[PDB]
CSV table of C-alpha atoms and ligand atoms in Angstrom, one decimal:
chain,number,residue,atom,x,y,z
W,1,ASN,CA,-8.9,19.5,-41.5
W,2,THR,CA,-8.2,17.0,-38.3
W,3,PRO,CA,-8.7,13.2,-38.6
W,4,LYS,CA,-11.2,11.4,-36.4
W,5,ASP,CA,-8.4,9.8,-34.4
W,6,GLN,CA,-6.9,12.7,-33.5
W,7,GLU,CA,-10.3,14.5,-32.9
W,8,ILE,CA,-11.7,11.9,-30.2
W,9,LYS,CA,-7.8,12.3,-28.7
W,10,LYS,CA,-8.4,15.6,-28.3
W,11,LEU,CA,-12.1,15.6,-26.5
W,12,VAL,CA,-10.6,12.9,-24.2
W,13,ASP,CA,-7.5,14.9,-23.3
W,14,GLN,CA,-9.9,18.0,-23.0
W,15,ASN,CA,-12.7,15.7,-20.4
W,16,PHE,CA,-10.7,12.8,-19.2
W,17,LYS,CA,-7.2,13.4,-18.7
W,18,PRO,CA,-7.6,16.9,-16.2
W,19,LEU,CA,-9.4,13.9,-13.4
W,20,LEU,CA,-5.4,12.2,-13.2
W,21,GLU,CA,-4.1,15.6,-11.9
W,22,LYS,CA,-7.6,16.4,-10.0
W,23,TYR,CA,-7.6,13.3,-8.5
W,24,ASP,CA,-4.1,12.3,-8.5
W,25,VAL,CA,-4.8,9.0,-10.7
W,26,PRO,CA,-1.6,6.8,-11.3
W,27,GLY,CA,-3.2,5.3,-14.6
W,28,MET,CA,-6.4,5.7,-16.6
W,29,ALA,CA,-7.7,3.7,-20.1
W,30,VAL,CA,-10.1,5.6,-22.3
W,31,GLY,CA,-11.8,3.8,-25.0
W,32,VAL,CA,-14.4,4.6,-27.6
W,33,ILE,CA,-16.1,2.3,-30.1
W,34,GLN,CA,-18.0,4.3,-33.2
W,35,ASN,CA,-19.1,2.4,-36.3
W,36,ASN,CA,-17.2,-0.5,-35.7
W,37,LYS,CA,-13.6,1.4,-35.1
W,38,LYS,CA,-12.0,1.5,-31.7
W,39,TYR,CA,-10.0,4.2,-30.5
W,40,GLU,CA,-7.6,3.9,-27.5
W,41,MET,CA,-6.5,6.2,-25.1
W,42,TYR,CA,-3.9,5.4,-22.6
W,43,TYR,CA,-2.3,7.7,-19.5
W,44,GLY,CA,-0.1,7.0,-16.7
W,45,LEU,CA,1.1,4.2,-15.2
W,46,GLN,CA,-0.3,0.9,-14.1
W,47,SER,CA,2.2,0.3,-11.7
W,48,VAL,CA,3.8,3.4,-10.0
W,49,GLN,CA,6.7,1.8,-8.0
W,50,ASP,CA,7.5,-0.6,-11.6
W,51,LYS,CA,7.1,2.8,-13.7
W,52,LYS,CA,5.0,0.8,-16.1
W,53,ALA,CA,3.0,2.5,-18.5
W,54,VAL,CA,-0.9,1.8,-18.8
W,55,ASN,CA,-1.3,0.0,-22.1
W,56,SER,CA,-3.5,-2.4,-24.4
W,57,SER,CA,-2.6,-5.3,-21.8
W,58,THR,CA,-3.0,-3.6,-18.8
W,59,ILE,CA,-5.9,-5.8,-16.7
W,60,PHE,CA,-8.2,-3.5,-14.7
W,61,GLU,CA,-10.7,-4.4,-11.7
W,62,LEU,CA,-14.3,-3.9,-13.2
W,63,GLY,CA,-16.0,-3.6,-9.9
W,64,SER,CA,-19.7,-3.4,-10.4
W,65,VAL,CA,-19.7,-3.5,-14.3
W,66,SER,CA,-18.6,-7.1,-13.5
W,67,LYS,CA,-22.9,-7.4,-13.0
W,68,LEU,CA,-23.0,-6.8,-17.0
W,69,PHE,CA,-21.5,-10.0,-17.3
W,70,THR,CA,-23.4,-11.7,-14.7
W,71,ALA,CA,-26.7,-10.8,-16.1
W,72,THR,CA,-25.1,-11.7,-19.8
W,73,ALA,CA,-24.5,-15.3,-18.3
W,74,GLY,CA,-28.1,-15.4,-16.7
W,75,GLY,CA,-29.8,-14.5,-20.3
W,76,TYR,CA,-27.6,-17.2,-21.7
W,77,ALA,CA,-28.8,-19.9,-19.5
W,78,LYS,CA,-32.7,-18.4,-19.7
W,79,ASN,CA,-32.2,-18.7,-23.4
W,80,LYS,CA,-30.6,-22.3,-23.1
W,81,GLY,CA,-33.2,-23.5,-20.8
W,82,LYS,CA,-31.4,-23.8,-18.0
W,83,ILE,CA,-33.0,-21.4,-15.9
W,84,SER,CA,-36.3,-19.5,-15.9
W,85,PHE,CA,-36.9,-16.1,-14.6
W,86,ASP,CA,-39.8,-17.0,-12.4
W,87,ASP,CA,-37.9,-19.7,-10.9
W,88,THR,CA,-36.8,-19.4,-7.4
W,89,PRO,CA,-33.3,-19.9,-6.2
W,90,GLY,CA,-34.4,-22.8,-4.0
W,91,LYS,CA,-35.0,-24.7,-7.3
W,92,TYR,CA,-31.5,-24.7,-7.9
W,93,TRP,CA,-29.9,-24.3,-4.6
W,94,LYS,CA,-31.9,-27.1,-2.7
W,95,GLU,CA,-31.3,-26.2,0.6
W,96,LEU,CA,-32.9,-22.7,0.3
W,97,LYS,CA,-36.6,-24.8,-0.2
W,98,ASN,CA,-39.1,-24.0,2.2
W,99,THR,CA,-36.8,-20.6,3.3
W,100,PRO,CA,-38.1,-16.8,3.1
W,101,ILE,CA,-35.5,-16.2,0.3
W,102,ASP,CA,-37.3,-18.6,-1.8
W,103,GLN,CA,-40.2,-16.7,-2.5
W,104,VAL,CA,-38.3,-14.2,-4.7
W,105,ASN,CA,-37.8,-15.0,-8.1
W,106,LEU,CA,-34.6,-14.8,-10.0
W,107,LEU,CA,-35.3,-11.8,-12.3
W,108,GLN,CA,-36.1,-9.9,-8.7
W,109,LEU,CA,-33.1,-11.2,-7.1
W,110,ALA,CA,-31.1,-9.8,-10.5
W,111,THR,CA,-32.9,-6.5,-10.1
W,112,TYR,CA,-32.6,-5.9,-6.1
W,113,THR,CA,-36.3,-6.4,-5.3
W,114,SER,CA,-36.1,-8.8,-2.7
W,115,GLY,CA,-37.4,-6.4,-0.5
W,116,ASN,CA,-34.6,-6.8,2.6
W,117,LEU,CA,-30.9,-7.3,1.0
W,118,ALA,CA,-28.6,-4.5,1.7
W,119,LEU,CA,-25.6,-3.6,-0.6
W,120,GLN,CA,-23.0,-5.8,0.9
W,121,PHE,CA,-22.7,-9.3,2.4
W,122,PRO,CA,-22.1,-8.9,6.1
W,123,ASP,CA,-18.1,-9.0,7.1
W,124,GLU,CA,-17.7,-12.0,8.8
W,125,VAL,CA,-20.1,-13.7,5.7
W,126,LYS,CA,-16.8,-15.2,3.8
W,127,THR,CA,-16.8,-19.3,3.6
W,128,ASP,CA,-19.6,-21.4,1.5
W,129,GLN,CA,-21.3,-22.2,4.1
W,130,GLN,CA,-21.6,-18.6,5.7
W,131,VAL,CA,-23.4,-17.7,2.5
W,132,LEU,CA,-26.1,-20.7,2.9
W,133,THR,CA,-26.7,-19.8,6.6
W,134,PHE,CA,-27.1,-16.0,5.2
W,135,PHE,CA,-29.9,-16.8,2.8
W,136,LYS,CA,-31.4,-19.5,5.1
W,137,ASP,CA,-31.6,-17.0,7.6
W,138,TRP,CA,-33.1,-14.5,5.3
W,139,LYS,CA,-36.4,-12.9,6.3
W,140,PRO,CA,-38.7,-10.5,4.1
W,141,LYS,CA,-38.9,-6.6,5.2
W,142,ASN,CA,-40.5,-4.9,2.1
W,143,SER,CA,-43.2,-6.7,-0.2
W,144,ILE,CA,-41.2,-8.5,-2.6
W,145,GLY,CA,-40.8,-6.9,-6.3
W,146,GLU,CA,-41.7,-3.4,-4.9
W,147,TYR,CA,-38.6,-1.8,-3.6
W,148,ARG,CA,-35.3,-1.6,-5.4
W,149,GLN,CA,-31.9,-1.7,-3.1
W,150,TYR,CA,-29.0,-1.8,-5.0
W,151,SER,CA,-27.5,-5.0,-3.5
W,152,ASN,CA,-24.2,-7.4,-4.2
W,153,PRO,CA,-25.6,-10.2,-2.1
W,154,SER,CA,-28.9,-10.1,-4.4
W,155,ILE,CA,-27.1,-10.5,-7.9
W,156,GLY,CA,-24.6,-12.8,-5.9
W,157,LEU,CA,-27.4,-15.0,-5.1
W,158,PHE,CA,-28.6,-15.0,-9.0
W,159,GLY,CA,-25.4,-15.7,-10.6
W,160,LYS,CA,-24.9,-18.7,-8.1
W,161,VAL,CA,-28.0,-20.1,-9.2
W,162,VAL,CA,-26.9,-19.7,-12.8
W,163,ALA,CA,-23.8,-21.4,-12.3
W,164,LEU,CA,-25.8,-24.3,-10.6
W,165,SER,CA,-28.3,-24.3,-13.5
W,166,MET,CA,-25.1,-24.9,-16.0
W,167,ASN,CA,-23.4,-27.4,-13.7
W,168,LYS,CA,-20.4,-25.2,-13.6
W,169,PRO,CA,-18.7,-22.8,-10.7
W,170,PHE,CA,-19.6,-19.2,-11.9
W,171,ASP,CA,-16.1,-18.3,-12.3
W,172,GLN,CA,-16.0,-21.3,-15.3
W,173,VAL,CA,-19.2,-20.0,-16.2
W,174,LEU,CA,-17.6,-16.7,-17.5
W,175,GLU,CA,-14.0,-18.0,-18.5
W,176,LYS,CA,-14.8,-21.0,-20.2
W,177,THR,CA,-18.3,-20.2,-22.2
W,178,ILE,CA,-19.0,-16.1,-21.7
W,179,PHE,CA,-15.7,-14.9,-22.4
W,180,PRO,CA,-14.7,-17.4,-25.0
W,181,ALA,CA,-18.3,-16.9,-26.8
W,182,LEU,CA,-17.5,-12.8,-26.5
W,183,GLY,CA,-14.1,-13.3,-28.1
W,184,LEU,CA,-13.1,-12.1,-24.9
W,185,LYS,CA,-9.3,-13.3,-24.4
W,186,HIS,CA,-7.7,-11.1,-21.8
W,187,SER,CA,-10.9,-11.1,-19.1
W,188,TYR,CA,-10.4,-12.8,-15.9
W,189,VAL,CA,-12.3,-13.9,-12.8
W,190,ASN,CA,-9.1,-15.4,-11.6
W,191,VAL,CA,-6.1,-13.8,-13.1
W,192,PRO,CA,-3.3,-16.6,-13.7
W,193,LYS,CA,0.1,-16.0,-12.6
W,194,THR,CA,1.4,-15.7,-16.1
W,195,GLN,CA,-0.6,-12.6,-16.3
W,196,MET,CA,0.0,-11.1,-12.9
W,197,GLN,CA,2.6,-8.5,-15.0
W,198,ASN,CA,-0.2,-6.9,-16.6
W,199,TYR,CA,-2.5,-6.8,-13.7
W,200,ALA,CA,-2.4,-3.1,-12.6
W,201,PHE,CA,-1.9,-2.1,-9.0
W,202,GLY,CA,-5.2,-0.3,-7.5
W,203,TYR,CA,-4.4,2.6,-5.7
W,204,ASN,CA,-6.2,3.6,-2.4
W,205,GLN,CA,-7.3,7.0,-1.5
W,206,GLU,CA,-3.7,7.4,0.1
W,207,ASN,CA,-2.2,6.4,-3.1
W,208,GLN,CA,-1.0,3.1,-1.6
W,209,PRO,CA,-1.2,0.0,-4.2
W,210,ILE,CA,-4.0,-2.4,-3.1
W,211,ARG,CA,-5.8,-5.1,-5.2
W,212,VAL,CA,-9.7,-6.6,-4.8
W,213,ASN,CA,-9.8,-8.7,-1.9
W,214,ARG,CA,-11.5,-12.0,-2.8
W,215,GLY,CA,-14.6,-12.2,-0.6
W,216,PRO,CA,-17.2,-14.7,-0.7
W,217,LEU,CA,-17.2,-16.9,-3.9
W,218,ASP,CA,-20.7,-15.7,-4.4
W,219,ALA,CA,-19.4,-12.2,-4.4
W,220,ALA,CA,-17.5,-12.4,-7.5
W,221,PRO,CA,-21.3,-11.9,-9.6
W,222,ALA,CA,-21.1,-8.9,-8.0
W,223,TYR,CA,-17.4,-7.5,-8.5
W,224,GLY,CA,-14.9,-10.0,-9.2
W,225,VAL,CA,-14.2,-9.8,-13.1
W,226,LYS,CA,-11.2,-8.1,-14.4
W,227,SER,CA,-10.6,-7.1,-17.8
W,228,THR,CA,-8.6,-5.0,-20.4
W,229,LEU,CA,-9.6,-1.9,-22.5
W,230,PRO,CA,-9.5,-3.9,-25.9
W,231,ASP,CA,-11.6,-6.6,-24.2
W,232,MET,CA,-14.2,-4.1,-22.8
W,233,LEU,CA,-14.4,-2.2,-26.1
W,234,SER,CA,-15.1,-6.1,-28.0
W,235,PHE,CA,-17.8,-5.9,-24.9
W,236,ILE,CA,-19.2,-2.6,-25.7
W,237,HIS,CA,-18.9,-4.0,-29.5
W,238,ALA,CA,-21.2,-7.0,-28.8
W,239,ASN,CA,-23.9,-4.7,-27.0
W,240,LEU,CA,-24.0,-2.9,-29.8
W,241,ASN,CA,-24.2,-5.5,-32.6
W,242,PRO,CA,-25.6,-8.6,-31.1
W,243,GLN,CA,-26.2,-10.4,-34.5
W,244,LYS,CA,-22.1,-11.1,-34.3
W,245,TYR,CA,-23.1,-14.0,-32.2
W,246,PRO,CA,-25.0,-17.3,-32.1
W,247,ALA,CA,-28.7,-17.0,-31.1
W,248,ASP,CA,-28.4,-17.6,-27.8
W,249,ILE,CA,-25.4,-15.4,-26.9
W,250,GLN,CA,-27.4,-12.9,-29.3
W,251,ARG,CA,-30.6,-13.3,-27.3
W,252,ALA,CA,-28.6,-13.2,-23.8
W,253,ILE,CA,-27.2,-10.0,-24.6
W,254,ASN,CA,-30.6,-8.5,-25.8
W,255,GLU,CA,-31.8,-10.0,-22.3
W,256,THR,CA,-29.4,-7.4,-20.8
W,257,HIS,CA,-31.1,-4.7,-23.0
W,258,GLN,CA,-34.7,-4.9,-21.8
W,259,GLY,CA,-35.4,-2.6,-18.8
W,260,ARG,CA,-38.1,-4.1,-16.4
W,261,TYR,CA,-39.2,-1.5,-14.6
W,262,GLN,CA,-38.6,2.2,-13.8
W,263,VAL,CA,-37.2,4.1,-10.8
W,264,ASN,CA,-38.1,7.7,-12.1
W,265,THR,CA,-36.0,8.6,-15.3
W,266,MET,CA,-33.8,5.1,-15.0
W,267,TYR,CA,-35.0,1.8,-16.2
W,268,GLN,CA,-33.7,-1.4,-14.5
W,269,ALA,CA,-32.6,-3.6,-17.5
W,270,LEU,CA,-30.4,-7.2,-16.5
W,271,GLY,CA,-27.2,-5.4,-15.2
W,272,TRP,CA,-27.3,-2.5,-17.3
W,273,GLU,CA,-29.4,0.7,-16.5
W,274,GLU,CA,-31.5,2.1,-19.3
W,275,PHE,CA,-32.5,5.5,-20.1
W,276,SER,CA,-34.4,6.9,-23.0
W,277,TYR,CA,-32.0,8.7,-25.5
W,278,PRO,CA,-31.3,11.4,-25.6
W,279,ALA,CA,-30.6,11.6,-21.9
W,280,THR,CA,-30.2,14.7,-19.9
W,281,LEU,CA,-27.0,14.7,-17.7
W,282,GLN,CA,-28.7,14.8,-14.6
W,283,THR,CA,-31.0,11.7,-15.9
W,284,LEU,CA,-27.4,10.1,-15.6
W,285,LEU,CA,-26.2,11.7,-12.8
W,286,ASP,CA,-29.5,10.6,-10.5
W,287,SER,CA,-29.0,7.2,-11.7
W,288,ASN,CA,-25.5,7.6,-9.5
W,289,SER,CA,-27.3,9.8,-6.7
W,290,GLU,CA,-27.1,8.1,-2.8
W,291,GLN,CA,-31.1,8.2,-3.2
W,292,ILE,CA,-30.9,5.7,-6.3
W,293,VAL,CA,-27.6,3.6,-5.1
W,294,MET,CA,-27.9,3.6,-1.0
W,295,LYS,CA,-31.3,3.8,-0.7
W,296,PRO,CA,-34.6,1.8,-1.2
W,297,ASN,CA,-37.0,3.0,-3.9
W,298,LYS,CA,-40.3,2.1,-5.2
W,299,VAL,CA,-40.2,0.3,-8.2
W,300,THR,CA,-42.8,1.1,-11.3
W,301,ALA,CA,-44.0,-0.3,-14.3
W,302,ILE,CA,-42.4,0.7,-17.3
W,303,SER,CA,-44.8,3.5,-19.1
W,304,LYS,CA,-42.5,4.6,-22.1
W,305,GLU,CA,-41.1,1.7,-23.5
W,306,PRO,CA,-38.0,3.6,-25.1
W,307,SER,CA,-37.5,3.1,-28.4
W,308,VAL,CA,-34.4,4.9,-29.1
W,309,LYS,CA,-32.1,4.2,-25.9
W,310,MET,CA,-28.7,4.4,-24.4
W,311,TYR,CA,-27.3,2.2,-21.2
W,312,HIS,CA,-24.5,2.5,-18.7
W,313,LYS,CA,-23.0,1.3,-15.6
W,314,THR,CA,-20.5,2.5,-13.0
W,315,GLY,CA,-18.3,0.3,-11.5
W,316,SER,CA,-15.9,0.5,-8.6
W,317,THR,CA,-13.4,-1.4,-6.1
W,318,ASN,CA,-11.3,-0.1,-3.8
W,319,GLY,CA,-8.5,0.8,-5.9
W,320,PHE,CA,-10.1,0.8,-9.2
W,321,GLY,CA,-12.8,2.9,-10.8
W,322,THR,CA,-14.7,1.7,-14.5
W,323,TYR,CA,-17.8,3.3,-16.8
W,324,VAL,CA,-19.0,1.6,-19.7
W,325,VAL,CA,-21.7,3.2,-21.7
W,326,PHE,CA,-23.6,2.7,-25.2
W,327,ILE,CA,-26.0,4.5,-27.4
W,328,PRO,CA,-26.9,2.0,-30.2
W,329,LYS,CA,-28.8,4.3,-32.3
W,330,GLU,CA,-25.4,5.9,-32.8
W,331,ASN,CA,-23.5,2.9,-32.7
W,332,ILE,CA,-21.3,4.8,-30.4
W,333,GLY,CA,-20.1,3.3,-26.9
W,334,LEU,CA,-17.1,4.6,-24.4
W,335,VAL,CA,-15.1,2.5,-21.5
W,336,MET,CA,-13.0,4.2,-18.8
W,337,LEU,CA,-10.9,2.5,-16.5
W,338,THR,CA,-8.6,4.0,-13.7
W,339,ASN,CA,-6.8,2.5,-11.1
W,340,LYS,CA,-7.9,4.9,-8.5
W,341,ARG,CA,-11.8,5.5,-7.6
W,342,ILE,CA,-13.0,8.8,-8.6
W,343,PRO,CA,-16.3,10.3,-8.1
W,344,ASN,CA,-19.2,8.5,-10.1
W,345,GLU,CA,-20.1,12.1,-11.4
W,346,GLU,CA,-17.1,12.9,-12.9
W,347,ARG,CA,-16.7,9.6,-15.1
W,348,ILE,CA,-20.7,10.5,-16.1
W,349,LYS,CA,-19.6,14.0,-17.1
W,350,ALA,CA,-16.7,13.3,-19.1
W,351,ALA,CA,-18.2,10.6,-21.2
W,352,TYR,CA,-21.3,12.8,-21.6
W,353,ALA,CA,-19.0,15.7,-22.9
W,354,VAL,CA,-16.8,13.1,-25.0
W,355,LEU,CA,-19.7,11.4,-26.5
W,356,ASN,CA,-22.0,14.1,-27.5
W,357,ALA,CA,-19.2,16.2,-29.2
W,358,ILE,CA,-17.8,13.5,-31.3
W,359,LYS,CA,-19.1,14.1,-35.1
W,360,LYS,CA,-21.4,11.5,-35.9
P,401,YDB,B1,-20.5,-1.5,-7.8
P,401,YDB,O1,-19.0,-0.7,-8.3
P,401,YDB,O2,-21.8,-0.7,-8.1
P,401,YDB,C1,-20.6,-1.8,-6.3
P,401,YDB,C2,-20.9,-0.6,-5.2
P,401,YDB,N1,-19.6,0.1,-4.7
P,401,YDB,C3,-19.6,1.4,-5.5
P,401,YDB,C4,-18.6,2.2,-4.9
P,401,YDB,C5,-18.2,3.1,-5.4
P,401,YDB,O3,-18.6,4.1,-5.9
P,401,YDB,O4,-17.0,3.5,-4.9
P,401,YDB,N2,-17.9,1.1,-4.1
P,401,YDB,N3,-18.5,0.1,-3.9
P,401,YDB,N4,-18.8,-1.9,-6.0
P,401,YDB,C6,-18.3,-2.9,-4.8
P,401,YDB,O5,-19.2,-3.2,-4.1
P,401,YDB,C7,-16.7,-2.8,-4.4
P,401,YDB,S1,-16.5,-4.5,-3.1
P,401,YDB,C8,-15.0,-4.7,-2.5
P,401,YDB,N5,-14.6,-5.5,-1.8
P,401,YDB,N6,-13.5,-5.5,-1.3
P,401,YDB,C9,-12.5,-4.6,-2.5
P,401,YDB,N7,-11.0,-4.6,-2.3
P,401,YDB,S2,-13.5,-3.8,-3.4
């Protein structure tokens, strides 16, 4: 026989470890949770110049996986009566009243269906007034609610409206409310100086050490969260077992599991991307295709409400890669964290092979 932990370690060795040499990745953390049992696998260095090994205290930048905490915070404020998904941003940011952006509702902002919001804020938009001027000068292009265009400013305005409804800055909404409620003790929007020695360097395509740039404050809901592998395994555990939490946090997590519309085989939930399970590999790869990620796509109402579902989300900054995935019916999830970007298809393919080969 071979113990289950050695079986998972071998599968991660055969599928994820080759990616380090293939893409010259300094460090990697891979974690699997199955039936409430966590398995952690660390590779390489969190800092090349310091020869510091990746370990359970290593803090990675989550990139777009931050959007799952913004969605959770949004579901929390919705179930606590602070917002309604039918509300518009001008209701909470009063300066946006009687402006074109005030016709899009909060759910449409969180699911990227405003009809005229690109992937990124403009480069010059950085200060608080510049973000307000951007949304004030916003004008519609496509019919509101009909086309999904993956957008950081879109969910950034949603996260900003969520924070205003709780009378707290967004970084406090996560670090004072959502992170403590989920048991995450090493997840940050702003890493304190006492934890900087655990903050890994990220590495660009020239393997130069880099870290994320503090852009507009309203970009943190889009890609500004940093966490460790044990905290992300706890976060996957929360999505698998929402009953571990009081009602409003439990309903917040379930809110992020409810698909809102379809784009081909992809269900757009709150933050999470949802799929019928079992999913083909090409279904999961399609979700990160240039056509889905970079272009506007007409949305369709959900036809098949999936009874058996699975969810995932890719995330990247300039020097980090992330991938999270879980399947509720199999009580299993996976997290991948790297301090260098690797193609999204390689993260999806490697996790697909690991999860399907793990004996249930
Ligand atoms: B998110 O990860 O999806 C989002 C979009 N994205 C994906 C990728 C990729 O596949 O490599 N790159 N961006 N991530 C971001 O928007 C990161 S924005 C940053 N601004 N400054 C930095 N140093 S990272």
